[PDB]
Amino acid sequence: GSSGSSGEHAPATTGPLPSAPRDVVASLVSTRFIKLTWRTPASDPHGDNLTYSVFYTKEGIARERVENTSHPGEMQVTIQNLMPATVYIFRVMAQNKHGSGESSAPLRVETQPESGPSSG
Numbered sequence: 001g002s003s004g005s006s007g008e009h010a011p012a013t014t015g016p017l018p019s020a021p022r023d024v025v026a027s028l029v030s031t032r033f034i035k036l037t038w039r040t041p042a043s044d045p046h047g048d049n050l051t052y053s054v055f056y057t058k059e060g061i062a063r064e065r066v067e068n069t070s071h072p073g074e075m076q077v078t079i080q081n082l083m084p085a086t087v088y089i090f091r092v093m094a095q096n097k098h099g100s101g102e103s104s105a106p107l108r109v110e111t112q113p114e115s116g117p118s119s120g
Helices: none
Strands: 022-029 034-039 051-058 065-068 076-079 087-095 100-103 107-110
Touching: 022 087, 022 107, 034 051, 034 087, 051 076
Parallel strands: none
Antiparallel strands: 022 034, 034 076, 051 065, 051 087, 087 100, 087 107
16 A cells, blocks of 8 residues: 655654454354454444454464454454464454554453364
8 A cells, every 4th residue: 555664663644543443352263263253443333444453473472463354344353374272362453544543452362272183
């Protein structure tokens, strides 16, 4: 999106920003992924004109990856390509014509210990 660059995170003129979503919870916890589910943010009761970004990162790790909801307004999203029996901090955030507002609270989600190699 015509991204830019800076030297010292120089300040830039921008309008107001929304507020992270609420009721941030995991509808389901898979061994290779985790189902997330949240409600509309106070700033946007419809959050239909703003996308939602989910940042996941192992407890302690700073390197986190963002996952844009396949579709805007989706009050739910799935995070595949995860490790079983491993804690992960999921953070949901809203995004509108402006950009990234506030990052929801860090949700501690722990996957389940896969069955293992034995197919059985």
